[PDB]
């Protein structure tokens, strides 16, 4: 009913999954709970499943995220306990536990953390019929039956009939024996099966037969069976049929099954995981009920139903699931695009799925079945390549667990038009043509030829024979790839790089829309969740920075805005009002604009003038030369907020005490602290200052200091008293600093077309090359990247952007504009440039001799360059990786307790690692002393290291260490714990004496 005439919601998948869960999965799980009766009198407690009612959360989301509490709902079910002596059943409602609730965006709040549930792709239960060719002889044919639990009832055939099951570890097993054990009398078996001559010539249980509803259906499909859907059990007729098909495969009457086909796979959504978690929680609850009944019998007391049930199992189960499950990950909130793209991921790796190493090559390639249902250019780069992928824009999840795609039906009928979400297996038996119909050759139009898809193949057929047509432009891609303008002119390899780099953008202090776009930024910003959308019609009577008042139908609703908040990836979140006071807004329109969004469209970068030429080497490899205008005009300024927290953990000996007056500290510090041991709001701090001062008696000084690189204003501090832990808990003090970061040498910039670079010099505007207009270019890029990485759409974008800037237009172009004609992008770009040149009379914009190229001058000398250069205004983004974060340096500070090597990590102030591939290079160069120094006194030799500082301060020569490092000594100790000795035992060549080194 929805998504067949417009782009569906990006978060509709999680929405419908959570809805189906709450609708049916809770009741289905509550139905299967057993009747607790563990006694001689058989005192029985029961839960009335019909009286299942969830309750609204006691706290709001804005309070859960603030107080680090979970956002859940209360499950109340009426229960009846029939006592043995009372001979009656008292009925009361019990609080089983809390069930987490999902937001409209798909995210859940557990312990104050935003977490998303990534979907998993698992093979569907069924019969599979693979084959394998033997080294010598005929090819072996095998049929595997897959169960919901994961049972494998294999069947094999040798050169003879030899219908042997591979269930047993032994050589083989008799299929006739299995059929006789099933119930067959050895006569009806041969009577029912086809080709009975072959069968007659040849002369644990619950989990294998636990076929799902899906399993039943599939079994019926492959092996024609009329077994009702309800009977989801491995019937012997199914086995008989399986055998029949297997023998038939030997004579050529069969078709093997492709296990990479989607129709053979199921998708597990948040509902499937929540249902299993609820079942496990119910099992734990039944165990706890049995235990408390056993205890009440020991204490000679018949208790009320409330006394039996405790709220622990449900809460602890859901908490452990959200905390430790491999398919529950924290939401990435670097930019609004990440929030939406995170919930569309489909993963092969997971609990019950292929591990990175396990996955065969075949698993990781596109299968023709993935067309329109999965993204063919969005994967995870690394060892898990081809195992983590996204979900198509127009896809939906089906009733049977299969992803479905929208296909138009061009076949003539009563309606003559349909949009059907065909499942993966069904679209194979259809002629799907993605081409247009704008061709006439003096014959009827239906006689024209067009490429089409049939039986997982490509072929050319007449328009009379095509049943389906793929009209939607964004049907075969995902949100990440669809945001790439002119994607047809870019290589498929660079598309993945561009999709990955769009995810890294940092929201800037100011936002500007893109001149050239694909038109998906609107719905992206709509479904991102960082936008204020009204839920009621009315008028905006009052406008304020903190809140917005919307008066409608005699009711006033207040919407709270976000003012300089902090995301999970240290990126600022802020919202600004868009609508003025006194205008009407419908239910759905935009009230305010969040970060990285202006005018309701996603805006992850800026539009700057760009020239493609080499400049004095500053552009070698990939490197960008940028002007100072981007610096002193705050074009790429961004705000980053980092949090630091230390809990006041109360030890058994003494609790921690927070005092401002702490001795043994210099007077230059502690200025920011208040009367209480905490920094004040609005205080500028730097590296090595004290944020929270604690006496820590148990006295000492476990304080909070700033690390290297932390220089920002203290925006807010929170004193968080922790409760609900069944006992007094430590208070938490969270400080927040805001670091304004400008664009600097070493920062990464990127373009939507896969172009990435690192700034190398900030030249002034006077030295920058200027156009014939007189304006200096903002950035200069290397023109040799285009033939290397094969990105041609960037040129188009630059030019169209120049044209737009001059004519004050914004172009939202759907991909694959060459379906209309040939060189449609080129025609559009050249036409818009000419118009700009005519309207604003700048002849330079369109040069008839070389369209799209102009001749610029040098800022230094003032002489024109020989060849023309490309001048445009592309959309450049600033990436999260920044130099400040990557800078690091260690002299001699801290060591590991056991290894005694220097520590790891930039935050921990640790050195760099000399691996085996570097020791090899050092040995090849022949630098023995450098290797020895690095392996002993710069790393592990405690005495030598202690002496190094003294020798360097005094200035004396550092002697060569002769003792063994701590790593070797450790080995000796370990090996001798393993009862193995190790002695150096050096022998002097002078006097032939053995000397042990300890």
């Amino acid at each position: 009913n929805e998504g067949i005439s417009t782009i569906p919601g990006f978060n509709q998948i999680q929405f419908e999954g959570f809805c189906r869960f709450i609708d049916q999965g809770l009741t289905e799980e509550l139905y299967k709970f057993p009747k607790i009766e563990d006694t001689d009198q058989e005192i029985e407690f029961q839960l009335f499943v019909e009286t299942y009612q969830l309750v609204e959360p006691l706290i709001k989301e804005r309070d859960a995220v603030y107080e680090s509490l979970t956002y859940s709902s209360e499950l109340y079910v009426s229960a009846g306990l029939i006592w043995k002596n009372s001979r009656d059943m008292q009925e009361q409602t019990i609080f089983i536990g809390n069930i987490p609730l999902m937001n409209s965006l798909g995210t859940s709040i557990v312990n104050g953390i935003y977490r998303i549930v990534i979907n998993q792709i698992l093979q569907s239960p069924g019969i599979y019929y693979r084959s394998e060719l033997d080294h010598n002889g005929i090819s072996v044919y095998t049929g595997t039956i897959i169960s919901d639990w994961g049972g494998r009832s294999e069947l094999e055939i040798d050169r003879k009939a030899r219908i042997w099951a591979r269930v047993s570890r032994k050589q083989k097993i008799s299929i006739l024996v299995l059929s006789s054990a099933m119930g067959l009398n050895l006569r009806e078996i041969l009577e029912n099966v086809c080709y009975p001559e072959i069968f007659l010539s040849f002369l644990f249980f619950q989990q294998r037969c636990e076929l799902g509803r899906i399993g039943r259906r599939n079994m019926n499909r492959r092996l024609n069976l009329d077994i009702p859907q309800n009977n989801t059990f491995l019937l012997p007729r199914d086995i008989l049929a399986a055998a029949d098909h297997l023998i038939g495969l030997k004579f050529g009457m069969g078709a093997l099954d492709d296990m990479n086909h989607l129709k053979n796979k199921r998708i597990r959504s948040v509902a499937d995981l929540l249902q299993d978690q609820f079942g496990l929680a119910l099992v734990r609850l039944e165990n706890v009920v049995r235990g408390t009944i056993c205890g009440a019998i020991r204490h000679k007391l018949i208790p009320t139903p409330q006394n039996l049930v405790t709220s622990t199992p449900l809460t602890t189960t859901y908490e452990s699931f959200f905390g430790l499950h491999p398919l529950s990950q924290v939401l990435d909130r670097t930019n609004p695009l990440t929030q939406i793209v995170h919930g569309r991921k489909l993963s092969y790796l997971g609990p019950g799925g292929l591990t990175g190493r396990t996955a065969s090559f075949r698993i990781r390639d596109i299968h023709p079945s993935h067309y329109g249902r999965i993204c063919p250019i969005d994967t995870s780069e690394g060892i898990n390549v081809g195992l983590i992928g996204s979900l198509a824009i127009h896809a939906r999840i089906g009733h049977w667990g299969s992803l479905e795609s929208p296909f138009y039906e061009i076949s003539e009928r009563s309606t003559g038009v349909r949009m059907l979400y065909l499942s993966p297996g069904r679209d194979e038996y259809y002629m799907v043509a993605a081409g247009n119909s704008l061709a006439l050759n003096q014959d009827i139009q239906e006689e024209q030829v067009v490429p089409a898809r049939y039986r997982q193949e490509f072929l050319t057929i007449a328009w009379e024979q095509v049943h389906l047509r793929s009209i939607f432009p964004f049907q075969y891609f995902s949100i990440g790839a669809s945001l790439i303008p002119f994607i047809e002119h870019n290589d498929a390899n660079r598309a993945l790089m561009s999709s990955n780099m769009q995810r890294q953008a940092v929201p800037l202090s100011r936002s500007e829309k893109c001149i050239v776009g694909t038109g998906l930024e609107r719905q992206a910003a709509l479904d991102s969740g960082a936008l204020a959308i009204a839920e009621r019609e009315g008028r905006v009577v009052y406008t304020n920075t903190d809140k917005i008042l919307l008066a409608g139908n005699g009711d006033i609703l207040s919407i709270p805005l976000v003012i300089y908040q902090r995301s999970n990836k240290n990126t600022c979140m802020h919202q600004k009002l868009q609508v003025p006071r006194g205008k009407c807004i419908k239910k759905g329109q935009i009230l305010a604009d969040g970060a990285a969004t202006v005018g309701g469209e996603l805006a992850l970068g800026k539009n700057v003038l760009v020239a493609y030429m080499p400049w004095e080497g500053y552009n070698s490899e990939d490197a960008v030369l940028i002007s100072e205008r981007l610096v002193y005009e705050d074009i790429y300024t961004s705000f980053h907020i980092r949090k630091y927290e230390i809990q006041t953990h109360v030890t058994s000996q003494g609790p921690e005490k927070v005092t401002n007056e702490i001795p043994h500290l210099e007077a230059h510090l502690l200025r920011n602290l208040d009367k209480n041991g905490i920094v004040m709001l609005g205080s500028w701090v730097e590296t090595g200052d004290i944020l929270v001062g604690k006496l820590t008696p148990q006295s000492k000084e476990t304080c909070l200091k700033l690390p290297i690189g932390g220089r920002g204003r203290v925006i807010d501090v929170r004193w968080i008293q922790k409760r609900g832990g069944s006992s007094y808990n430590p208070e938490t003090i969270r400080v927040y600093i805001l670091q304004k970061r400008e664009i600097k040498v070493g920062d990464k910039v990127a373009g939507r077309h896969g172009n990435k670079g690192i700034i190398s010099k900030i030249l002034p505007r006077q030295d920058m090359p200027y156009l014939q207009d007189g304006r200096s270019v903002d950035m200069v890029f290397n023109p040799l990247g285009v033939p290397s990485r094969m990105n041609v759409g960037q040129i188009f974008e630059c030019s169209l952007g120049l044209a737009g800037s001059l004519l004050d237009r914004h172009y939202r172009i759907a991909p694959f504009d060459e379906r209309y004609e040939q060189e449609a992008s080129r025609k559009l770009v050249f036409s818009e440039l000419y118009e700009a040149s005519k309207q604003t009379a700048n002849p330079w914009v369109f040069e008839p001799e070389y369209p799209g190229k102009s001749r610029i001058f040098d800022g230094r000398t003032g002489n024109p360059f020989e060849q023309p250069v490309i001048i445009g205004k592309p959309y450049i983004l600033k990436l999260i990786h920044q130099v400040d974060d990557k800078i690091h340096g260690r002299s001699s500070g801290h060591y590991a307790l056991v290894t005694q090597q220097p520590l790891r990590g930039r935050a921990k102030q640790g050195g760099q690692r000399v691996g085996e591939m570097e020791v090899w290079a050092l040995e090849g160069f022949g630098v023995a002393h450098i290797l020895q120094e690095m392996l002993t006194y710069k790393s592990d030799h405690i005495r030598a290291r202690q002496e190094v500082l003294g020798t360097t301060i005094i200035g004396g020569t550092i002697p060569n260490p002769e003792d063994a490092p701590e790593s070797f000594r450790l080995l000796v100790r370990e090996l001798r714990s393993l009862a193995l000795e190790l002695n150096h035992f050096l022998v002097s060549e002078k006097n032939f004496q053995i000397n042990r080194k300890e």
Binding site: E621, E916, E918, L970, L971, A979
Partner: protein, 653 residues
């Protein structure tokens, strides 16, 4: 040429229980012996203090603090005044607490245990020495059985002489009552033994010479006609022969290695030093507590009464041996023995073996002090020996050197004032930092260090930024592109290391790849484009002229300097042809083509016009003038190379 003889020989072997005892045994001043671990307790309850005679005991291992003791009185080691080495009240010695790192312990085991490596590996050394099958030994170790004759060097009255006794149903109650009960206990060891005494008696009472003799005899017997038989029989004969050869080799090695097979069964188990397993609590220590608990329960059951049931003590012996197996090496038997959270326990074999094991993670790879990483950018005006280095990294790398500089000059009195001045970012600190590293070499390196050119050496130049500048021509070596790559920095402290870095590891000394000896540092992307534009040429044929010149180049320059000046003054274009006079060199590479036209006048001077040059001569066969036809690009490249060579030669003097 007598070489410098260095002789170092590491040695490994099985250690006797006496040595593992002497690794821990120590004699206090009072006269007690310390070293035995007997209690599973690691630390006190809500006191965070080491428990006595425990896994972390101060008495047996050492004090937890330097100069402090568990008794409560601090002392100074090495003082002039006489001080007792160890407190009379408390066993802990007054020493620096580094000993806890290097000090070992040992738990005495009432019932012996068998090493997992020797027993349960597919090649079983115990099953090799004792010709008894591996299944029999694994049973006798794990499943209650009996071995009839474990001693062959003592008198034996009973004539059982059996390999595996599957049951004790044989009459033994009438035999024990008949003999004095103490007497029965005395000879039961020579009689049927069970669990861990039979293996030790077989390994101890054994003659390796008789073993090699019998194995050689059986080898000589077999192989006469086994190959003639079927493949199965030949395979069995071959496997037996290989087993016999391995037995011979093991016995021959045991004869002359001062190592006894008795040490394969562990009477006493060593305990790792406490610091190496610091409690946060480790599994090592969890398994240690488990084996300690099981061993003390076994000792209690043994010391309680001899009339105790054999089943209980045997089951506790099996539990002790399984705990010892899980401690030493888990996973060889195939049983994971997970924790309370269904997680497998780590063992010493898992610690040593693995990529993340002891060897590869620690010994062959480690991190160093004096190191920093940052992103890399192009510095296109640097020399092959110079590299741009940020100041915030240099101040941390060379911090000790600038401290020494502040101490030497009258700028800082002490180390603290100098460190405070360095933290304050005073201007003199940067001057001292510059003066410090003018002759110091920096070792840059990259994470994918595939070849030997991944690590090189440069001269650090102080820059104002956060990005490490690198020379462009040196990028190929590091496979570096400025798209986000990062690099590390290393400072050689010793003078020998500085000499090595400055002489061997510099870029000017490594210009040829070690694969085929080809130039690795060459113009790649933009310099190649510039050179190609310089030396490309000019439009020669129909491109330069619209009509044939038959119906109907111009500039003549005496010096290359004049042509370059005219190009700088925009008089002539880059590709514009010209004539350049040469001083009798004829070094221009060209095709072997005869003159296209030769003009000979009456007086004797003949002009020879070639494709790219004109050579005027006279009647005396004397080359009067030579004019080369080229462009400013070729002469510019030639002049820049020649002037580079000449400037190098002049600067040498």
């Amino acid at each position: 040429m007598i070489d410098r003889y260095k002789h170092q020989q590491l040695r490994i072997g099985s250690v006797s229980p006496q040595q593992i005892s002497a690794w821990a045994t120590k004699i206090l001043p009072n006269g007690e012996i310390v070293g035995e671990v007997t209690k599973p307790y690691t630390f006190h309850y809500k006191t965070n203090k080491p428990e006595k005679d425990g896994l972390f005991c101060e008495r047996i291992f050492g004090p937890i603090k330097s100069g402090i003791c568990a008794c409560g009185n601090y002392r100074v080691i090495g003082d002039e005044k006489e001080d007792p080495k160890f407190c009379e009240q408390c066993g802990v010695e007054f020493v620096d607490s580094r000993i806890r790192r290097y000090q070992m312990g040992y738990i005495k085991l009432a019932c012996p245990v068998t090493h997992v490596w020797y027993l349960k590996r597919l090649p079983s050394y115990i099953a090799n020495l004792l010709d008894k099958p591996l299944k029999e030994l694994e049973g006798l170790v794990y499943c209650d059985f009996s071995f009839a004759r474990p001693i062959t060097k003592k008198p034996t009255f009973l004539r059982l002489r059996g390999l595996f006794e599957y049951e004790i149903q044989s009459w033994k109650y009438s035999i024990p009552l008949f003999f004095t009960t103490q007497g029965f206990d005395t000879f039961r060891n020579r009689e049927i033994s069970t669990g861990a005494g039979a293996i030790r008696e077989q390994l101890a009472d054994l003659d390796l010479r008789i073993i090699i003799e019998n194995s050689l005899v059986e080898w000589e017997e077999l192989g006469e006609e086994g190959h003639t038989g079927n493949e199965w029989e030949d395979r069995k004969v071959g496997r037996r022969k290989d087993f016999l050869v391995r037995r011979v080799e093991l016995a021959k090695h045991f004869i002359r290695t001062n190592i006894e097979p008795e040490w394969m069964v562990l009477c006493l188990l060593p305990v790792l030093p406490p610091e190496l397993r610091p409690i946060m609590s480790s599994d090592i220590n969890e398994l240690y507590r488990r084996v300690i608990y099981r061993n003390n329960t076994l000792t209690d059951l043994l010391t309680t009464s001899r009339s105790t049931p054999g089943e209980l003590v045997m089951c506790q012996e099996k539990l002790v041996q399984e705990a010892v197996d899980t401690l030493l090496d888990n996973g060889i038997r195939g049983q994971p023995m997970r924790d309370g959270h269904n997680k497998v326990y780590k063992s010493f074999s898992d610690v040593i073996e693995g990529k993340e094991g002891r060897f590869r993670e620690t010994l062959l790879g480690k991190r160093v002090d004096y190191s920093g990483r940052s992103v890399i950018v192009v510095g296109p005006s640097l020399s092959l020996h110079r590299c741009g280095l940020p100041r915030e990294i240099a101040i941390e790398l060379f911090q000790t050197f600038v401290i020494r500089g502040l101490i030497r000059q009258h700028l800082a009195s002490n180390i603290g004032v100098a460190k405070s001045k360095i933290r304050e970012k005073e201007p003199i600190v940067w001057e001292i930092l510059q003066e410090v590293m003018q002759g110091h070499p920096v070792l840059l390196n990259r994470a994918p260090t595939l070849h030997r050119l991944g690590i090189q050496a440069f001269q650090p130049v102080l820059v104002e930024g956060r990005a490490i500048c690198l020379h462009p021509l040196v990028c190929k070596g590091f496979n570096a592109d400025f798209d986000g790559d990062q690099m590390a920095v290393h400072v050689p402290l010793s003078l020998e290391a500085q000499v090595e870095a400055r002489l061997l590891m510099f870029s000017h000394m490594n210009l040829l790849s070690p694969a085929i000896g080809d130039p690795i540092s060459v113009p790649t992307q933009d310099m190649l484009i510039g050179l190609y534009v310089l030396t490309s040429g000019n439009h020669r044929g129909i491109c330069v002229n619209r009509y044939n010149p038959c119906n109907r180049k111009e500039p003549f320059f005496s010096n290359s300097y004049d042509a370059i000046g005219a190009y700088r003054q925009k008089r002539i274009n880059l590709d514009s042809p010209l004539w350049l006079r040469w001083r009798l060199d004829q070094r221009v590479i060209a095709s072997r083509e005869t003159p296209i036209e030769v003009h000979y006048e009456s007086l004797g001077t003949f002009y020879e016009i070639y494709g790219h040059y004109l050579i005027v001569r006279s009647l005396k066969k004397q080359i009067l003038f030579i004019y080369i036809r080229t462009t400013v690009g070729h002469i510019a490249l030639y002049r820049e190379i020649e002037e580079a060579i000449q400037g190098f030669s002049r600067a040498y003097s």
